[PDB]
Amino acid sequence: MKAAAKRISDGVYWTGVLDWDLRNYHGYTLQGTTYNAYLVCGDEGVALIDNSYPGTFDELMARVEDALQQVGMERVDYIIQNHVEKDHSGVLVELHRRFPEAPIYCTEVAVKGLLKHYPSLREAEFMTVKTGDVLDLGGKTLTFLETPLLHWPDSMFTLLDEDGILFSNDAFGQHLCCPQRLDREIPEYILMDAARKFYANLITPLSKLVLKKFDEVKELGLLERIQMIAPSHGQIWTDPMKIIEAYTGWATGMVDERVTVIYDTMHGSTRKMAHAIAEGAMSEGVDVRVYCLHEDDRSEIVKDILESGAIALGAPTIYDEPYPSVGDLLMYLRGLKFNRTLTRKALVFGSMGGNGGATGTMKELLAEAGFDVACEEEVYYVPTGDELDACFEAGRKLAAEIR
Amino acid sequence: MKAAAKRISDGVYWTGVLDWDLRNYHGYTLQGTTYNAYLVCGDEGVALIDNSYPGTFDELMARVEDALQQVGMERVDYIIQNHVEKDHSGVLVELHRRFPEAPIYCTEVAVKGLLKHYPSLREAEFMTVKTGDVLDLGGKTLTFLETPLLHWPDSMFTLLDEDGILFSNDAFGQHLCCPQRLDREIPEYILMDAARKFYANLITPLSKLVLKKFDEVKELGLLERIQMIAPSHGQIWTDPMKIIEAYTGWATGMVDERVTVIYDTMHGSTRKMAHAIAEGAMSEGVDVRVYCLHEDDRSEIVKDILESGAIALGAPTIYDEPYPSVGDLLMYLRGLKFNRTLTRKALVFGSMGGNGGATGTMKELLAEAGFDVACEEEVYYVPTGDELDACFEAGRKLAAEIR
Ligand SMILES: Cc1cc2nc3c(=O)[nH]c(=O)nc-3n(C[C@H](O)[C@H](O)[C@H](O)COP(=O)(O)O)c2cc1C
Ligand SMILES: Cc1cc2nc3c(=O)[nH]c(=O)nc-3n(C[C@H](O)[C@H](O)[C@H](O)COP(=O)(O)O)c2cc1C
Ligand SMILES: [Fe+3]
Ligand SMILES: [Fe+3]
Ligand SMILES: [Fe+3]
Ligand SMILES: [Fe+3]
């Protein structure tokens, strides 16, 4: 198959897979993604860093073969697996079949995870690596940095010394599938918004670990050596500090003044409330986003939560409970643990017809999920003008609090 | 607008609205529904029992006018509101405008509810009615029976007792939009499955109150000669015992041997488990339904839950939580309180890549939701043959236990 490697540096090639078609990946919406694998060709040896999702071997291999042709090398000598998830290890068995002499470099935990996914690999040779271990390729060296929980127990980064390229696995990734490989080659908005969505959905709960790893990267003296970050999805950063800074901002709760209003409704009263809350918040000059759960994906909602100092979450009561769609978001939030960056303020609200109970339930679940629920607005059925005014005031107050 | 009424009884006419296009109604999927309103004419007065959704006055009125002309009458004299929800009260303001002399008969609670939805009814004449209260139309008499929590605090039934006709509001309803108005005019499977879905989604938590309300009709001696149940949605029961018996079964946990297996997955492992569980259960000869939360509506899942003595709920772990779709289904199950018909047995399962957590949480949440969670199959990444055999056995045991 005809698929070209893309040169990133002398002897460093993107040889990944363009998944134009993927639209939902573990309840993350996207418009395609990529599975970036890299071929690092030293004078002596060739390493493949990561691979790709099952069934994409033909593409990865076509690009690998192109890159080997370009550097005039014969084979991949070392298979590096920064992470075991199947979008990055899904053709490992096929790569092991193609390059039977290539040891697989990965963390110890990764070996276990790989073997569980691919029991036939028991026969393969694994080189377990820990932080600071080095693979010498001849004029190119790869230094491994274990990155447990960033985003998986098996994860590591691989730093190409000399080129200063940090192969960061999913970290700094973005789910974008562009024919352009570099950050600077696409609109900055799209790049950063995808980076943002990726952090919000995948990195938020790891935020404290990400800061700790950055400290470590700096302590080990690696930070100053990073000229490029080449993640496992999306664009390669020729401006690594842009994404480091953004990750530090995101990990530390740096936000512009913004309220995200999220609601669902059966009969529309909670929607009227949500608009009034949004109007109120807008009145204080903060940015405002409004999401309806019936329509909007949790992955986009949490993207804006990342950049919001407060949220408002609304739902009617159905048989003493919140409308169940908030259950999905709230479970997702419980996992993301936004409090790990910033304990965001929350307003809970909703219409009800009887004893209510949605806002209380939501308040409890938001607490569990690391939000500071200061206020609640609850309306019996259809909000009166006064009640809608009170919702505006609630949103104004919420916005004023995060100013 | 041309729209004909339907004579369903002597001086009792159907004058409702066909909502062909509705697909999703407060998180209940349907293929349209009806807002059944009935023109009960006697010797003196004409009650409109319930009405229809906002923006459908032209259709309703057209049928009421066509009914009045079929009975040779001038006006609706009484606007009966068994229930305040907007699908049955959404043209009440317009009815009050068209029939300003008609008082509105409803429960005391319904007045507060109606007034909140439609403030302009502050001027309206309300006649509040309680259990045992009557409305003589001449020679035809309506009886009210409060049915708080069936399904709302405002709800009641209107009885044309002596004719054995029950206007049951939502009770016994089904979300069906057919040209045919009667139970016996459409396929029994469709009728009963829509009635089943309706019970599962709306009635389940009210099961005990349903049984108690049957008892109260019986004690009030009103039950005696049931000939028609005319609900707010869907088909009119010319065979009311069919649905009464079905409700009694549903309320009392009468099930055939059936396991419903429900799962979500990111990379397919939990799906493999779900299949093996389903296979195990099938080996015991019981009926098995398998739903995927990414694909399937909670309203359909719970329709099967109602007809199942056991369920299996599976999901992978994401940042220490169940995959979030299960948060929606659980929050829904929590409102439905299936344990009020039968404490069904449940198996939780799922794949995980580190510490797991989802099955434990799902165990906790399902038990809060009214299930007897008989254990837990958690697999690290991809199941081995033995692990799948273990899932088979878990489903077999689940099934065997419900035989
Ligand atoms: C199936 C159903 C069940 C409901 N159960 C409750 C309940 O248990 N408690 C309550 O206060 N309201 C209950 N409600 C009433 C709604 O909460 C009320 O209609 C509210 O105004 C709806 O808000 P919304 O317009 O944003 O959907 C229920 C409504 C429906 C659709
Ligand atoms: C975003 C992400 C976060 C994850 N977090 C956890 C975790 O917190 N604990 C755990 O045990 N596994 C975690 N996993 C690992 C998955 O549970 C594991 O891949 C599992 O085998 C997925 O099962 P599935 O194939 O049914 O989707 C995570 C996976 C992803 C994609
Ligand atoms: Fe990953
Ligand atoms: Fe990835
Ligand atoms: Fe209703
Ligand atoms: Fe209804």
- In chain A, the domains with their CATH numbers are 1-252 (3.60.15.10), 258-401 (3.40.50.360)
CA distances from A69 to A78, A97, A374, B118, B240 (A): 17, 20, 62, 76, 79
Q: Is B19 in contact with B35 (CB distance < 8 Å)?
A: yes
Whole-number Å distance between alpha carbons of A304 and A153: 27
This structure's resolution (Å) is 1.7
| H or E segment and range at residue B106 | strand B104-106
| H or E segment and range at residue B12 | strand B12-14
Whole-number Å distance between alpha carbons of A85 and A16: 15
Ligand 1 binding pocket includes A112 (Cβ within 6 Å): no
Whole-number Å distance between alpha carbons of B81 and B158: 9
Which has the closest alpha carbon to B80: B122, B141, B24, B2? Answer: B141
Asked if B318 and A117 come within 8 Å (Cβ–Cβ), the reply is no
Q: Mutating which of B263, B273, B328, B336 best tests the A interface, going by the most A Cβ atoms within 10 A?
A: B328
Peptide bond into B151 cis (omega under 30): yes
CA distances from B28 to A204, A268, B297 (A): 33, 16, 8
Token representation of residue B123: 């001027």
Which region, left, alpha or beta, applies to residue B206 given φ > 0 means left and ψ of -120 to 50 means alpha?
alpha
* Secondary structure (3-state) at A68: helix
Q: Is B324 in contact with B352 (CB distance < 8 Å)?
A: no
What distance in Å separates residue B91's CA from the closest CA in chain A?
15
Tell me the longest C-alpha to C-alpha distance in chain A: 76
Token representation of residue B135: 């409305």
Alpha carbon B302 to chain centroid distance?
A: 11
Whole-number Å distance between alpha carbons of A254 and A246: 9
Method: X-ray
Backbone phi, then psi, for B168, in 5-degree steps? -100, 10
Which of A24, A119, A322 shows the shortest C-beta gap to B331?
A322
Ligand 4 centroid to residue A85 C-alpha, Å: 7
Torsion sign, CA atoms A21, A25, A31, A36: negative
Burial of A381 (0-12, 13-18, 19+ CB in 10 A): buried
Which has the closest alpha carbon to A31: A260, A197, A181, A277? Answer: A197
Half-sphere exposure of A361 (CA within 13 A, CB side): 26
Backbone phi, then psi, for A200, in 5-degree steps? -60, -40
> Could you say which DSSP state residue A215 is in?
H
* Secondary structure (3-state) at B203: helix
Alpha carbon A355 to chain centroid distance?
A: 39
Alpha carbon B102 to chain centroid distance?
A: 30
Whole-number Å distance between alpha carbons of B318 and B92: 48
Whole-number Å distance between alpha carbons of A76 and A65: 9
CA distances from A18 to A59, A80, A274, A332, B248 (A): 9, 20, 39, 28, 57
Whole-number Å distance between alpha carbons of A277 and B16: 37
* SS3 of chain B: helix, strand, coil, percent, to 5: 40, 25, 35
CB distance from A382 to chain B under 8 Å?
yes
Residue nearest to atom 20 of ligand 1 (CA): A352
Q: One-letter amino acid identity for A6?
A: K
In the block, which residue shows the tokens 């940090």?
Answer: A166
Atom of ligand 1 minimally distant from the CA of A268 = 25
Backbone phi, then psi, for A139, in 5-degree steps? 70, 0
Tell me which ligand sits closest to the C-alpha of residue A83: 3
Contacts of B357 in chain A (CB under 8 A): none
Query: In sequence order, which residues have a C-beta less than 8 Å from that of residue B123 and are 6 or more positions away?
Result: none
* SS3 of chain A: helix, strand, coil, percent, to 5: 40, 25, 35
* For helices B188-198 and B298-306, angle between their N-to-C axes, nearest 10 degrees: 100
What distance in Å separates residue A109's CA from the closest CA in chain B?
10
Atom of ligand 2 minimally distant from the CA of A26 = 31
Whole-number Å distance between alpha carbons of A88 and A36: 8
Q: Mutating which of A93, A118, A328, A386 best tests the B interface, going by the most B Cβ atoms within 10 A?
A: A328
Whole-number Å distance between alpha carbons of A316 and A329: 15
Burial of A238 (0-12, 13-18, 19+ CB in 10 A): middle
Q: Is B326 in contact with A331 (CB distance < 8 Å)?
A: yes
Which of B25, B85, B330 shows the shortest C-beta gap to A327?
B330
Whole-number Å distance between alpha carbons of B157 and B170: 9
* Secondary structure (3-state) at B218: helix
Q: One-letter amino acid identity for A156?
A: M
Q: One-letter amino acid identity for B51?
A: N
User: Among the residues of A307-383, which ranges form H helices?
Assistant: 325-336, 358-368
Q: Is B61 in contact with B84 (CB distance < 8 Å)?
A: no
A·B CB contacts under 8 A: 107
Q: Is B304 in contact with B260 (CB distance < 8 Å)?
A: yes
Which has the closest alpha carbon to A67: A28, A43, A48, A39? Answer: A39
Asked if B298 and A323 come within 8 Å (Cβ–Cβ), the reply is no
Query: In sequence order, which residues have a C-beta less than 8 Å from that of residue A26 and are 6 or more positions away?
Result: B266, B267, B318, B323
Asked if B327 and A323 come within 8 Å (Cβ–Cβ), the reply is no
Ligand 5 centroid to residue B89 C-alpha, Å: 10
Burial of B300 (0-12, 13-18, 19+ CB in 10 A): middle
Ligand 3 centroid to residue A152 C-alpha, Å: 7
Peptide bond into B96 cis (omega under 30): no
**Length in residues, chain A:** 403
Beta strands in A213-354 (DSSP E): 228-230, 258-263, 287-292, 310-314, 317-318, 321-322, 344-352
Which of B86, B322, B331 shows the shortest C-beta gap to A267?
B86
Which has the closest alpha carbon to B296: B260, B342, B341? Answer: B260
Q: Is B358 in contact with B322 (CB distance < 8 Å)?
A: yes
Q: Is B257 in contact with B247 (CB distance < 8 Å)?
A: no
Q: Is B27 in contact with B84 (CB distance < 8 Å)?
A: no
Query: In sequence order, which residues have a C-beta less than 8 Å from that of residue B9 and are 6 or more positions away?
Result: B160, B163, B165, B228
**Length in residues, chain B:** 403
- DSSP string spanning A175-209? ----S--BGGGS-HHHHHHHHHHHIIIIIGGGHHH
Which has the closest alpha carbon to A324: B350, B301, B35? Answer: B301
Burial of A399 (0-12, 13-18, 19+ CB in 10 A): buried
* Secondary structure (3-state) at A117: helix
- Produce one character per residue of A138-156: b if its CB has 16 or more CB atoms within 10 Å, e if not: eebbbbbbbbbbbbbbbbb
Ligand 1 binding pocket includes A92 (Cβ within 6 Å): no
Which has the closest alpha carbon to A144: A188, A101, A187, A107? Answer: A107
Whole-number Å distance between alpha carbons of A84 and A88: 6
List the Cα angle A43/A79/A140 in 5-degree steps.
Answer: 25
CA distances from A73 to A40, A41, B39 (A): 11, 8, 87
Whole-number Å distance between alpha carbons of A320 and A314: 14
Whole-number Å distance between alpha carbons of B264 and B358: 11
- DSSP string spanning A156-181? EEEEEETTTEEE-TTTT------S--
Token representation of residue B116: 């909140």
Asked if A324 and B337 come within 8 Å (Cβ–Cβ), the reply is no
Contacts of A331 in chain B (CB under 8 A): 321-322, 324, 326-328, 330
Whole-number Å distance between alpha carbons of A222 and A156: 14
